[PDB]
Structure formats: C-alpha cells, structure tokens
UniProtKB/Swiss-Prot annotation, chain A:
GO terms for cellular component: host cell nucleus; virion component. This is Protein C42. Plays a role in host nuclear actin polymerization by recruiting p78/73 protein that is capable of activating an actin-related protein 2/3 complex to initiate nuclear actin polymerization. Keywords: Host nucleus, Late protein, Virion. Forms a complex with proteins E27 and p78/83. The interaction with p78/83 mediates nuclear translocation of P78/83. Interacts with protein Ac102. Interacts with IE0. It comes from Autographa californica nuclear polyhedrosis virus (AcMNPV). Its main location: host cell. Belongs to the baculoviridae C42 protein family. It is found in: Host nucleus; Virion.
From Swiss-Prot, chain B:
This is Occlusion-derived virus envelope protein E27. Belongs to the baculoviridae E27 family. The keyword Membrane applies. Pfam families: Baculo_ODV-E27. Interacts with host mus209/PCNA, cdc2 and cdk6. Forms a complex with proteins C42 and p78/83.
Length: 231, 244, 51, 132
C-alpha cells in the first residue's frame, strides 16, 4: 500500500492546524488565515491517534449544528483537556474549558454556512455562553461594586511618600544600544490588539455586544489631542 | 499647491539677469523624515528610562514570573504605584507625590472580575482605594500571541513615499520588553479616569466609565502640549460590518 | 521557457502568416502578476541592509 | 536582482554607493547569441543607395570587442540617471525609474551639445501589435 498521502507532510498538517487553533483560541497574530484543504487536513490528521479521535468526536458533534452544549463526561473530559494541552504543546499555559467552549462556538460558525466567497467578518458572539439571558452591564455594575466595597485591602500599603530613580546614565545608554534594532512600530500593534481582544476575553458572560463606538472614541482620543493642539 | 518656486538674479546696473526654479517636494520630505526620526528617538528614550527605573527595584526574577505567582502583595502594588507616578510626572514634571491614602486590592475571582477597565477606584470612602485583576493581567500577558513583525502600510504613491530606502542582568528579549507597553497603556487609560474623578465628581466619572465618549470635552485645556502615547493614529477596523 | 514555447506553438491551428511575438509566459510560479513597485520596496530594503 | 537596470546608485548613504548584478552581467555574456552573417535593410536604392554602390601577442579577435559596446551602452544608460539625481531631486529619481521617458525634458538645455552613441536612426520594432 501507499501510506504517503495520509500524513506525508505531517509537518504541514500539524503546523498549519496548530497555527489555526492558535488563531482561534490564542487569537495569536494577524495572518491570511485560510485553507479549506487544511481544514480537511485537520480531520485526517486527527484520524491517527486516540488522543486525537476524542477531540475529533467532540468536533464532529458540531455537525449536528444544534447549539446544545454536550454533557461533561467529567473524568474523560478532564483527560481530554490534558490531551488538548499536550497536543497544543503549550507551556501548560492555563488552557481551559472556557477556551474549549470558545473553539466549540468557533466551529459552531465555521461549517455552518457555505459562504463560498468571504465571510471576512469577526463573529464576536457566542451562543454557548453560560446563558442567553443577556443581561446588561449596568446590573453587574451593582453586583460587583457591592462585594468590592465589602472587601478589605490585602495590604495597607502606604505611609508617607517617596520616589524611585537612578542616574547611571552610561548604563542607560548601554541599554539603549541594546534596545535599538527593534521595529517598535510593528511590534507594539499586536499587543494593542491583544488588549482589544481582552474585552471579549473578559465577558464570556451575558455579554453586552456594544464595544465598537466607544473604541472609536478611544481612537478619537488622538482626534481630541489634535483639537487641543489647534485649540 | 505645486509651488514651482521661481527666482531671478541681476547684475547691478541691470545689464542682464538670470532665472531659475525649484520644488519644495524634496525639502518637505526630508523635514518629515527628520520629524519622525526625532519623535521615534524620544519615545524610545522614554521607554528606556521607564524600564531602567523599574529595573532599579531589585526584582529577584523576571517580570512575568511575578504575576504567574499570586502569593505576592508587595511587588504588584509597587509595580502599579511606580507606573502611576511615572505617568503623573510625565504630565507634571515638578510633581513628586500624592500625599498618601493610596491603597490597592488584589482581585482573584471571576465573581469579582469586571469587563473592560481592569483597574478600578473608589476615590474616597474616607480615602482612596484601588482594585486590580491579576488573573486578567496574566490573560493580557497571554504572551504566546506575539510573532515576528508584519510590514504592512497603505496609501503608497511612489518612492515619493519610499525615499527612506535611499535616505541613508536583563540582556533579554525585545519582545518581552515590548510586553511592558501593554501595562503602560493600561495604566495610562486608568490614569485618565483617576485624573478626571480627582478633578470632579463621582457621577461624571461613572458616565465616562459608561462611555469613554464624553471625555473629549473635559479633556481640554488639559493637554498643554503634553503629548501622550497615540502617535500612529490609524486606529480603525472594519466598520460597515457592524450591521446594527 | 521552451516548454511554454511549444505550449504556444500547436495552440495555433493557424497556417496564415502570424505576426505574433508571444513575449508572455504563463508559468511564473505565481497566481498572477504583481506590480514592480512592491519589488522596488523589497529589493531596495535588503540592498540597504547589505554592506 | 532588479528589473530592467543591472546597476543602481544610492546617491549619499552618508556617501555614494553602487550595486551591480554579476549574474545578469554573465547572462549578457552568454554570447552564443552572436553571429555576424546578416543583411542590412535598405530603401529606394536607385535614388538613395545605388550612388553608394560605387565606392570602396594579444592580437585578439573582434566579437568580444563588439561585446564591450554592450556594457558601454548599459553604463551610459545608468550614468544618465546617476547624473540626473546627482544634480536633482529624489522625486525625479522616483521618476526616471518609474519610467525613463520624460527625462528628455530635463536633458533639454542640459546636453553638452555633443552627440553620443546613437547614430543609426531606426531602433524599433512593430508597435501597433501591442494587442491589448
């Protein structure tokens, strides 16, 4: 027989599927993320270990397309979570059920429409959050602030006042020299978008859709700065 | 405004005269070059200063390990305080201290977590207090997301744009240093609200937290040339897709 | 190049005289032609890097 | 490499510098191209040309020497842009490279009143056959 085509570019299949999964759950970095052939390769690559076949089964459940959330086979779910951590080869970086559910919703939209051109659109929402009750921010404001006021500081950290500084100017210049080569301009934007994603990463809970216009105001902060410059 | 600047010269006693003409397009371009290099250097310097100042504080271990731990109460507080002071000096170079009353709260539970603004204040229930989500800060430092630099840009024209192609112990990774900018920006955002409420009442502070929108009025006669970290202003995304 | 030459010849069922200098080639290891300006960026950059 | 031009100058990266494509140079050196046995175009000979009918160690051969002309003319074309930007703006070094074309204007009143290396007045092909 010819066993080649099933895994010959194991390298491609693994690296691209892992890249894609990091794109979804880890939201990692901008890319021209797509290959439907890779999407299929995901499944074929899953079909050659049990520590895959479990996740493959779960993911197949999405082909039922209903938004129901599967029962937690607690022990097996936990072993599966560990297998996910392993197969993601991350520094045990707190891979969690919530991100798993986020991936479930990701596929809950992935196959669900044959949009054979380009749904080049964020689908921020998740049906499978803890409820579709979709209460608003305002009530949670009270709910949080209550316990906030109730709590006592873990340390009573301040008395008097001080300032820190150092003046090893030569040291600072040495640092500068070390620091020079890096394209700041590019390097920072990805972190900025990480901060952006952080909002959604917070509200997995009765989420409030609106973010966009207030973000636009955050951007028009620079607008206001220019206006101040001009009076 | 193409401004083919036009010039002539004369012999004294006006025997005869000569004409020439010239174009600003080189000069303005070089001006822009100098401008951007200048400001880039300034920003880099500022960041360096910040980093070194933090470095002074005798940390036993690399930054991220701190927040990966949760047993601390000193280090995290110190960090936050330092950043706040740095910002305040960036706006008021003559000013050095806040007259005590500054106190912090670690927050650990989703059931205490709050969306968006990750650092929160009660300016006086007798005195100021603050709250911080270390769990979230770790999430914001889900460092795995970072990758080599893309080099995209838009609105190109020709080498009219490209002319720079011819215009001439913590010894530790650039990317990890770069992660710091995140907390810089975060504390900056927070400092906005802190300053606002410190100047005014609680209800308008609540309104700003409801919408970081109405700020644009009150944040006026406030930035007397004290520039802040919004240099590359093309902060924008797909819009039409909002689809209500 | 020669392969494409032959893949341009029989293409003609054409026996009348042909003024056709098919300068073009299809097989340029890409989906479609880019501009030159991008290369004016890309080579220039690395050239400035070189010493 | 770069399209079109085997040579380029960076006018003052603190100081002038130049870059050149040895590979492409060799490709020009692939002179298996060359052969003399040919025939010139003519016209209207009775008036024009029939008159012309009636008139007449290192000892290296010619073909190579002929090839010299190649780099001669190439370096000429390069020198044009080099002179131009050396005298003028990087805007008109964007231009002149986006196309050569227009630089005739700047050469106006600029040329030394002496010709160079462009005798035989035809240099062209079929053109209308651009068949867009």
């Amino acid at each position: 027989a010819q066993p080649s085509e099933e895994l010959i570019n194991m390298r491609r299949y693994r690296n691209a599927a892992r890249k894609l999964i990091h794109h979804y759950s880890l939201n990692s970095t901008s890319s021209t993320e797509y290959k439907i052939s890779d999407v299929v390769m995901t499944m074929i690559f899953l079909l050659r270990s049990e520590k895959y076949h479990s996740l493959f089964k779960l993911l197949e459940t999405t082909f039922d397309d209903y938004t129901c959330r599967p029962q937690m086979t607690q022990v097996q779910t936990d072993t599966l979570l560990d297998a996910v951590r392993s197969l993601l080869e991350m520094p045990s970086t707190t891979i969690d059920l919530t991100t798993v559910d986020i991936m479930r919703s990701s596929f809950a939209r992935c196959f669900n429409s044959p949009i054979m051109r380009y749904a080049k659109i964020v689908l921020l929402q998740n049906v499978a959050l803890q409820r579709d009750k979709r209460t608003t921010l305002e009530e949670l404001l009270i709910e949080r602030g209550e316990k906030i006021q109730m709590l006592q500081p873990q340390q009573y950290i301040n008395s008097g006042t001080e300032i820190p500084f150092c003046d090893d100017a030569e040291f600072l210049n040495r640092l500068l020299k070390h620091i020079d080569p890096y394209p700041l301009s590019r390097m920072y934007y990805n972190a900025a978008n990480t901060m952006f994603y952080t909002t959604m990463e917070n509200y997995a809970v009765s989420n409030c859709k609106f973010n966009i216009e207030d973000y636009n105001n955050i951007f028009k902060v620079m607008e206001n700065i220019r206006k101040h410059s001009n009076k | 405004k193409c401004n083919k600047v036009r010039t002539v010269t004369e012999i004294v006693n006006s025997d005869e005269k000569i004409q020439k003409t010239y174009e600003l397009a080189e000069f303005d371009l070089k001006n822009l070059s100098s401008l951007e290099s200048y400001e880039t250097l300034k920003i880099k310097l500022a960041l360096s200063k910040y980093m070194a100042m933090l470095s002074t504080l005798e940390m036993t271990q690399p930054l991220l390990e701190i927040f990966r731990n949760k047993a601390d109460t000193r280090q995290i507080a110190a960090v936050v305080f330092s950043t706040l002071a740095f910002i305040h000096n960036r706006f008021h170079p003559l000013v050095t201290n806040f007259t005590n009353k500054m106190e912090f709260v670690v927050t650990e539970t989703n059931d205490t977590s709050i969306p968006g603004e990750p650092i929160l204040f009660t300016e006086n229930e007798g005195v100021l207090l603050c709250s911080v989500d270390r769990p979230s800060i770790v999430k914001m430092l889900s460092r795995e997301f970072d990758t080599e630099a893309l080099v995209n840009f838009e609105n190109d024209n020709c080498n009219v744009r490209i002319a720079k192609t011819f215009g001439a112990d913590f010894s530790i990774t650039e990317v990890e240093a770069t992660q710091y900018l995140t907390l810089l920006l975060t504390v900056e955002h927070a400092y906005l609200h802190y300053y606002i409420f410190k100047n005014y009442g609680v209800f308008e502070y609540c309104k700003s937290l409801t919408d970081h929108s109405l700020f644009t009025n009150k944040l006026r006669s406030t930035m007397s040339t004290k520039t802040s970290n919004l240099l590359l202003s093309k902060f924008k995304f797909t819009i039409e897709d909002f689809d209500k």
